[PDB]
Amino acid sequence: KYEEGFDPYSMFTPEQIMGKDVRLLRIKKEGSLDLALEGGVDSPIGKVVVSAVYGAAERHGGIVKGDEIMAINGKIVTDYTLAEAEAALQKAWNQGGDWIDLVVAVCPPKEYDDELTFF
Amino acid sequence: KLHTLEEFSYEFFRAPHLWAYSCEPLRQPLLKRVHANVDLWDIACQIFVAILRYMGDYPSRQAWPTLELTDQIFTLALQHPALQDEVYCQILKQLTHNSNRHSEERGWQLLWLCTGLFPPSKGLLPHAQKFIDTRRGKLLAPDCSRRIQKVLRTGPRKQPPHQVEVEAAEQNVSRICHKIYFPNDTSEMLEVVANTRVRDVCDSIATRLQLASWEGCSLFIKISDKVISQKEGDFFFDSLREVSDWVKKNKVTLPYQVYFMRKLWLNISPGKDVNADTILHYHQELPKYLRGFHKCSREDAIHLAGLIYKAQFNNDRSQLASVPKILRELVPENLTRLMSSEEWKKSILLAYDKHKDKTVEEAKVAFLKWICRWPTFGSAFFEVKQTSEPSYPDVILIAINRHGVLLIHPKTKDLLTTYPFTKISSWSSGSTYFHMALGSGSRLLCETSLGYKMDDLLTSYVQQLLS
Numbered sequence A: 001k002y003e004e005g006f007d008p009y010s011m012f013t014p015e016q017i018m019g020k021d022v023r024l025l026r027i028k029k030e031g032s033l034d035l036a037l038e039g040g041v042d043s044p045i046g047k048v049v050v051s052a053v054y055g056a057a058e059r060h061g062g063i064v065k066g067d068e069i070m071a072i073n074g075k076i077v078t079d080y081t082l083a084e085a086e087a088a089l090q091k092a093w094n095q096g097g098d099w100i101d102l103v104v105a106v107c108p109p110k111e112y113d114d115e116l117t118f119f
Numbered sequence B: 001k002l003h004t005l006e007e008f009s010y011e012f013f014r015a016p017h018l019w020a021y022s023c024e025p026l027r028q029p030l031l032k033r034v035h036a037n038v039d040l041w042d043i044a045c046q047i048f049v050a051i052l053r054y055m056g057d058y059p060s061r062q063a064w065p066t067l068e069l070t071d072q073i074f075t076l077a078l079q080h081p082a083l084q085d086e087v088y089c090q091i092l093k094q095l096t097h098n099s100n101r102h103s104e105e106r107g108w109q110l111l112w113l114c115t116g117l118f119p120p121s122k123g124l125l126p127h128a129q130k131f132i133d134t135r136r137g138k139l140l141a142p143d144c145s146r147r148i149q150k151v152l153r154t155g156p157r158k159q160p161p162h163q164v165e166v167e168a169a170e171q172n173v174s175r176i177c178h179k180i181y182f183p184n185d186t187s188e189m190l191e192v193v194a195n196t197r198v199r200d201v202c203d204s205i206a207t208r209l210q211l212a213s214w215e216g217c218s219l220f221i222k223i224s225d226k227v228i229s230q231k232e233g234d235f236f237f238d239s240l241r242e243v244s245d246w247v248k249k250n251k252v253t254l255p256y257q258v259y260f261m262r263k264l265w266l267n268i269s270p271g272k273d274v275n276a277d278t279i280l281h282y283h284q285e286l287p288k289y290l291r292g293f294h295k296c297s298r299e300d301a302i303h304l305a306g307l308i309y310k311a312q313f314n315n316d317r318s319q320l321a322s323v324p325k326i327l328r329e330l331v332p333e334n335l336t337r338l339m340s341s342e343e344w345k346k347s348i349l350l351a352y353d354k355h356k357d358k359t360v361e362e363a364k365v366a367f368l369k370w371i372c373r374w375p376t377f378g379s380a381f382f383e384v385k386q387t388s389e390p391s392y393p394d395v396i397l398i399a400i401n402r403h404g405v406l407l408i409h410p411k412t413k414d415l416l417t418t419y420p421f422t423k424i425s426s427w428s429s430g431s432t433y434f435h436m437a438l439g440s441g442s443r444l445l446c447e448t449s450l451g452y453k454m455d456d457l458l459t460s461y462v463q464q465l466l467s
Helices: A056-060 A082-094 B006-012 B038-055 B066-079 B082-094 B101-115 B125-133 B141-154 B163-170 B198-209 B236-250 B274-290 B298-313 B323-329 B341-355 B360-371 B451-466
Strands: A022-028 A035-040 A047-053 A068-072 A099-105 B176-181 B187-192 B217-223 B226-229 B256-262 B380-386 B395-401 B404-408 B415-419 B424-429 B433-438 B442-447
Touching: A022 A056, A035 A082, A047 A056, A047 A068, A068 A082, B038 B066, B038 B082, B038 B101, B066 B082, B066 B101, B066 B163, B082 B101, B082 B125, B101 B141, B101 B163, B125 B141, B163 B176, B163 B236, B176 B198, B187 B198, B198 B217, B198 B236, B198 B256, B198 B274, B217 B236, B226 B236, B226 B451, B236 B256, B256 B274, B274 B298, B274 B360, B298 B341, B298 B360, B323 B341, B380 B451, B395 B451, B415 B442, B424 B451, B433 B451
Parallel strands: B176 B256
Antiparallel strands: A022 A099, A035 A047, A068 A099, B176 B187, B217 B226, B217 B256, B380 B395, B380 B442, B395 B404, B404 B415, B424 B433, B433 B442
8 A cells, every 4th residue: 555544445345345455555756667568448458457567667566567556546446447447547647746646456476487488 | 793783673672872982961761662652761761871880981989879770770661661772772882893801891791780681672682682792702601592591481570670689790700609507506608599489499499408498488687676488489689679668668788598497387397307396496496495485394395405415516515514504495484493503404405415315306306296287287476455345464475287277375374365367357467456356257457567477377378288
């Protein structure tokens, strides 16, 4: 997280957060965000997730590849296409004030070997 | 005698010496047709500055890594061919009436790099040819001429010089060998040139190793704890940079190794190509077996451990002296609990003793023959979190092979289901997931960082079956 007092239930219905570890991040605007996204409603995973953290995202910590973006400055984006989510993230970064607020579902630890290299 | 761009400059150069060496930075391009594009003025001038820096003619204190200079000189000329003749003229300019031997030596290194990337255009080629031919006494000049011939034959590079090319250039060395590693813990040095294609390396490897064929094999780059196949039709040095760039984006030149391995396991019949079996196949299949990816009985494991011990140790019966170390190299990790250390040792020694009259090579082939009809033989494996099937465990094992895509229960090793190629209708991947669709049917969705690899293998198998 980046604000401790956040209650997901106050912003989402339980159906929207079932099984998710939902946290609030405040990211200070400096430099470029360099947070890449993938997914979207038009995609097989049906949600917006972080594909790479290159760097304002890297420097904040707290957000990594696989984490889901559920809201941007209070607007819920779980039903956005990828392009819509990128536009909203870029707009939030450019316009507005000193910080952006990202609500994220933190991806849990992997209980599998995600680095097999055999052929 | 010495051929010069003087007369060429009358027709094709800008107007203001200009075709001769100078330490003064250019302010517009040299060629009139490049000069005609104000939008190319800045790149043409930055190229010249980098050339000046590379040859040591830039009175700066901030010294640059050489690869950054060669990237600046050549990268945009590859994308915008209008700049290609400009780079040639800028280099030959600095090589003309250059009375500083260090600078001139460095200029010839740039011409050598350049002729490995793209040729001059039709109109400049006879001038570049005569420039080189009248200076055939310079160390790198004969090879510059040959490289122009070769790049006209194969077509132009897509990526600027690799650090291996630049290090040869800075040594004034035109012959380059690259180490290639094999799955049996050996390596060979392979000669490569600017226009070597991945498949050319493989051809030479198959000769060197006396393989009957390298169909379904390729080069691979081991880099940042990934192992990434190289495209057979690509230029070797283009592939190295393209994959490096990709790794740097998807996750200081990066350390790397190039391996030669089997990629596609199609119609593999152990004993048909014994060299392929004993260099490649045994040593790729052994670690997948030891990881416990196959459904194996205790008696299966005893039998195969006898062959594995023989393949690894030949006649040396002393290495089972300490079971805690060595058992992990002989028995799949899901089965070691099945019997105690001394019972494994006794059983394996009895099995091994049957191979006294076999060679190591014969033991490796026998190991392969005994497992080659298993549905999980000849596979790449992926552990993933699947999110599409409630009745499967969250974490499943996936095999991709000649048969399509297999879903495997990690605890029991049973085959949950098979997606044959003849029934897969689509698949897609991101950096966090892989998805596949069957018929009208069934869908698989899973969390993995290896979607790009699954995609590569599925595409490659489908392409090979279609051909």
